[PDB]
């Protein structure tokens, strides 16, 4: 409330000052000063981190509705370039969604005709920022800027050396896979964009550029039809050691000490990054989680954490830490949760060894093998006898004649075995040790603890004992357990 007013008290009659100077033209000698007065301090409304961010966005209707942006866009066709290069900056600085809708509606084509000139770097910088903020409008404008020569300009500017221009290009190329659907993402690889992102990703000069290029390539390799072409480009390998080495605290310190790029993505379109956490490609998940925890660490130092509340993003992070096989992604998510001030959820698993006959009946009903329940009732099978159930006793004593039926039952049996709770009998925590190598090994953790096997007693084992006592039947799994067990021979 009160902080909100102090922003527009100066901003409002000073943005009117701006309006005045825009539409009062003394040609090159006086438009210049006006643009400097409104560049020095209008952009400093992004330098007030208390209020004054929201104010700008809302206040853009006082400029856009009066027609000032339209007036200058009608006056940016002046043949001289000096009074145009310094004027196109406030265009990208005053681009918000409401200001974006009418430029996407009317006035399109002057940017497409100004993008033809690629020699002045001070001009190309502003044009790259314009295309960056224009990509994010809607699907139709994305299809029009890919159908026109919009992509060629930012694709040609990838061979330059300017740091700000390359950063703006990296940020520009990433607002296309978001608002492009699937056919535009299938056209971008046809327009050879994923290859021209190799220099922006392999850049030991700025880490910000590497992060932006890797998020831009990761948001595009989720489509299965173009994934086989994105891996051919030679860039899908760079995202893993990048997110591995870089700590999100360092990237936050590189974002909080810089005078710009504060409150980077914002609560407006952040949700487009959320399905990447749930996507099939793991590198998209880790880069999304990395960006989320970084901006969380940025925003946690202030009292702006409650914007996580009404968007329900903390919920999405809490749903992805339990039952998730990814060390980096789960580590970053747990770091984000513990830094934001919330607890990590623990999975609730069925305590199978301490079961009775009724629970075995109910589970047999659940897995669809109800026809055999009475047999299991006659022989008095409970959880301890169920977890140690073999094929011959299944065939003779329980009457499963077919081999396919027994294969199906053992499939459901192993699926239940990997997802059980063994804390009632496992003291030395062998389940996590087995799950560390592979989750598919956790199913053995009962047999081991049933055969009096412990961590401290695990390295002095033979493959014959694993085969006959612990009941491990696959030779591959036996070999892996043996080589991972005897490597830690006399560590204690």
């Amino acid at each position: 409330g009160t902080e909100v007013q102090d922003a527009l008290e100066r901003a409002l009659p000073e943005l009117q000052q701006a309006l005045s100077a825009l539409k009062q033209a003394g040609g090159a000698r006086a438009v210049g000063a006006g643009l400097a007065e409104v560049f020095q301090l209008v952009e400093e409304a992004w330098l007030l981190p208390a209020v004054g961010r929201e104010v700008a966005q809302g206040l853009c209707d006082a400029i856009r509705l009066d027609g000032g942006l339209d007036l200058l866009l009608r006056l940016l066709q002046a043949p001289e370039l000096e009074t145009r290069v310094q004027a196109a900056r406030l265009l990208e600085q005053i681009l918000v969604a409401e200001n974006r809708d009418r430029v996407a509606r009317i006035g399109l084509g002057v940017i497409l005709n100004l993008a033809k000139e690629r020699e002045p770097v001070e001009l190309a910088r502003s044009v790259a920022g314009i295309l960056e903020h224009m990509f994010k409008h809607s699907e139709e404008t994305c299809q029009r800027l890919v159908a026109a020569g919009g992509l060629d300009a930012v694709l040609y500017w990838c061979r330059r050396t300017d740091p700000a221009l390359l950063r703006h290009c990296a940020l520009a190329l990433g607002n296309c896979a978001l608002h492009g659907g699937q056919a535009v993402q299938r056209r971008m690889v046809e327009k050879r964009a994923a290859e021209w992102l190799f220099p922006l990703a392999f850049s030991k000069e700025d880490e910000l550029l590497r992060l932006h290029a890797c998020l831009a390539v990761a948001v595009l390799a989720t489509n299965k039809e173009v994934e086989r072409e994105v891996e051919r480009s030679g860039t899908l390998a760079l995202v893993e050691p990048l997110v591995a080495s870089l700590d999100p605290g360092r990237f936050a310190r590189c974002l909080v000490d810089a005078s710009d790029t504060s409150q980077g993505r914002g609560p407006d379109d952040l949700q487009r990054l959320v399905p990447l956490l749930d996507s099939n490609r793991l590198e998209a998940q880790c880069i999304g989680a990395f960006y989320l925890c970084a901006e969380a660490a940025i925003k946690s130092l202030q009292g702006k954490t409650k914007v996580f509340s009404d968007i329900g993003a903390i919920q999405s992070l809490k749903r992805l830490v339990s039952y998730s096989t990814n060390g980096t992604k789960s580590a970053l998510a747990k770091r984000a949760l513990r830094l934001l001030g919330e607890e990590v959820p623990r999975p609730i698993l069925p305590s199978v060894p301490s079961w009775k006959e009724a629970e075995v009946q109910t589970w047999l009903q659940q897995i669809g093998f109800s026809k055999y329940c009475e047999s299991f009732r006659e022989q008095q099978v409970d959880g301890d006898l169920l977890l140690r159930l073999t094929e011959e006793e299944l065939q003779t004593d329980l009457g499963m004649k077919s081999g396919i039926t027994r294969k199906r039952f053992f499939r459901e049996l192993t699926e239940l075995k990997t997802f059980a709770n063994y804390s009632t009998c496992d003291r030395s925590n062998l389940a996590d040790w087995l799950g560390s190598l592979d989750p598919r090994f956790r199913q053995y953790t009962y047999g081991l603890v049933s055969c009096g096997l412990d961590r401290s007693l695990l390295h002095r084992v033979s493959e014959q004992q694993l085969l006959e006592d612990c009941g491990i039947h696959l030779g591959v799994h036996r070999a892996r357990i043996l080589t991972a067990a005897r490597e830690m021979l006399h560590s204690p």
């Epitope: 809490k318 609730i348 069925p350 629970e359």
Partner: nanobody, 113 residues
Framework: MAVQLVESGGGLVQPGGSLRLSCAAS????????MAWYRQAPGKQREVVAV???????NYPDSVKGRFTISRDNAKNTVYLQMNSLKPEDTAVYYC??????WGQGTQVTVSS
């Protein structure tokens, strides 16, 4: 963890017509491995009606396939079972079940006029 479940819905419906039953848990529904809805006819043994796992993979018996739908909601932690076309033989006491041991209370459902 001692998990308590509560069921809501049921009563009497006209033969042919929809209904929605809900089971609400005391902890986060995303932590629980498996959830399920069971049916108990008068004077018989229980039967399973719907299952759902942590990744939203559901399985139904061949009798109710295409008429019943199970889904979990995480905003308010509640699993819903929606019945679309009811037949006179679907009169029973319905339960929810968490993991395999945690039971609910059950509600009566009848279909007549």
């Amino acid at each position: 963890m001692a998990v308590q479940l509560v069921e809501s819905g049921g009563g009497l419906v006209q033969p042919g017509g929809s209904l929605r039953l809900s089971c609400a848990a005391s902890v986060s529904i995303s932590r629980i491995y498996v959830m399920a809805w069971y049916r108990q006819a008068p004077g018989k043994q229980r039967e399973v009606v719907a299952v759902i796992r942590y990744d939203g993979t559901t399985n139904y018996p061949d009798s109710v396939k295409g008429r019943f739908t199970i889904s979990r909601d995480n905003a308010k932690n509640t699993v819903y079972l929606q019945m679309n076309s009811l037949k006179p033989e679907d009169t029973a006491v319905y339960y929810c079940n968490a993991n395999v041991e945690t039971w609910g209370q059950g509600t009566q459902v009848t279909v007549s006029s």
